Ligand binder design. Structure first.
Ligand code: HEC
Ligand code: HEC
Ligand code: HEC
Ligand code: HEC
Ligand code: ZN
Ligand code: ZN
Ligand code: ZN
Ligand code: ZN
Ligand code: ZN
Lengths: 106, 106, 106, 106
């Protein structure tokens, strides 16, 4: 899917997690986030469209998604163990990484 | 391609790195490894065919590739800077990740 | 030093990195941050003062410094190669680890 | 404790883990390993006695303990949750990191 769609999927499911009531909702939303983040990993954002794929900017862009995926996986673990409140708190730590990338490449 | 072909790629290019003389040959091998691991991401290993694609086991399986890809990209940095022996030490630690996943899922 | 001093050292030197324009300044600040984080390793934060020093919580507390120390080292590596902007890009994500520990434990 | 003593602690407690019957023995052993590795983190090994603490060798030596501690932390987490066989298996994957460091610096 394209980057815009990946971002709407991330945004939608992050807000679901914030408001969910059960592990199943949280796990389902985190699974969708993991897939959208892993898909966006290969994207070229408009700010960097003329940069080399080997460029430091793009390496930093891809690193941001690697970080985000690792955080999503950790939240998924917490949810698979039924620590819904801990998984929801982790989702709030996700936002910082979202914002870190946006503050640079949006 | 499929997981088996992805793994042949990882194995072949790990051997290239070990015997390499120059940084470009290590960079080339690591780049192919990175591509193979990203393609293996979507795969269902035989030992997990009895699980749902969103099961804890399948997310842990993909987390192994997340680790591997992080390490591959660290070693690619070293190679891009001319540090052949340093990249070769990193590949020794890469094998620990190969083995750890194989211990659980191969 | 104690945790209160270590956090001032982390915060002061993070601000130095944010305003730096040369690699020597960034390298100096990151080295001080690494020392402070290593020193903070042994600390017990007030909200875990009732927990055993090997509860899941205290190992998880130390793991937060383990993440930070890894990120500091990565940024230090970049500074040692003269890549100010790349080092400063890494300090921004560093901030999310500060925040994440504070969210759980401050 | 000195580096040799740290290494005896690591080796003894790795064997305890392989021989354990319950999660509490595995947890106690990993706790001892986490502490000994964190002590060893700041040591200078005989092989690197004449090297700059800022040398690539010493950076790589310290990084090896950073890797090992992260692995120990992950195994301790598994044991704490009653994934006893997985914790024992992870401790068995520590050896690859031990050996990778020994190859270079012992
Ligand atoms: C880089 C590594 C990013 C991370 C991590 C996250 N996002 Fe993102 N996002 C990024 C870019 C480059 C852009 C701009 C896309 C463009 O075409 O200009 C965006 C955009 C968004 C948007 C707006 C999309 C739109 O249709 O206008 C949203 C809502 C968004 N991003 C959300 C979001 C969330 C919730 C994230 C973490 C969970 C997140 N982003 C991470 C780059 C990066
Ligand atoms: C999990 C995340 C894995 C990682 C990381 C690596 N491998 Fe792997 N490998 C994995 C599976 C599940 C399988 C079985 C595939 C099947 O259909 O049977 C394999 C298989 C291989 C092979 C095939 C030959 C064999 O002895 O089985 C090779 C040559 C191989 N793997 C190599 C390899 C290397 C070098 C890796 C790291 C660089 C590596 N694998 C990582 C799962 C995972
Ligand atoms: C570097 C990053 C290392 C890691 C990780 C591990 N060890 Fe180690 N080990 C290292 C050095 C430099 C030395 C030599 C110390 C000396 O001064 O001679 C060692 C030594 C050992 C020994 C022998 C100790 C002795 O008294 O001679 C053992 C039994 C040993 N190391 C075990 C061990 C284990 C089990 C590890 C991982 C769990 C491990 N070491 C990690 C450097 C490093
Ligand atoms: C846990 C692993 C932490 C990490 C990582 C960081 N900090 Fe922290 N910080 C932590 C705690 C438990 C506390 C509260 C301690 C207390 O006695 O109440 C703090 C506090 C701070 C403060 C406030 C200092 C004060 O005068 O009260 C600052 C300014 C601060 N922390 C900064 C900071 C920075 C910049 C970090 C990353 C670079 C960082 N902290 C990481 C625990 C943890
Ligand atoms: Zn790179
Ligand atoms: Zn768990
Ligand atoms: Zn470098
Ligand atoms: Zn000591
Ligand atoms: Zn270094």
């Amino acid at each position: 899917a394209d980057l815009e769609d990946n971002m709407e999927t991330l945004n939608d499911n992050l807000k679901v997690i914030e408001k969910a009531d059960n592990a199943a909702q949280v796990k389902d939303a985190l699974t969708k986030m993991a897939a959208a983040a892993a898909d966006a990993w290969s994207a070229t954002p408009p700010k960097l469209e003329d940069k080399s794929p080997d460029s430091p900017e793009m390496h930093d862009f891809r690193h941001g998604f690697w970080i985000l995926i690792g955080q999503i996986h950790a939240a998924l673990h917490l949810a698979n163990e039924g620590k819904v409140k801990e998984a929801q708190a982790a989702a709030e730590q996700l936002k910082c990484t979202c914002n870190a990338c946006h503050q640079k490449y949006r």
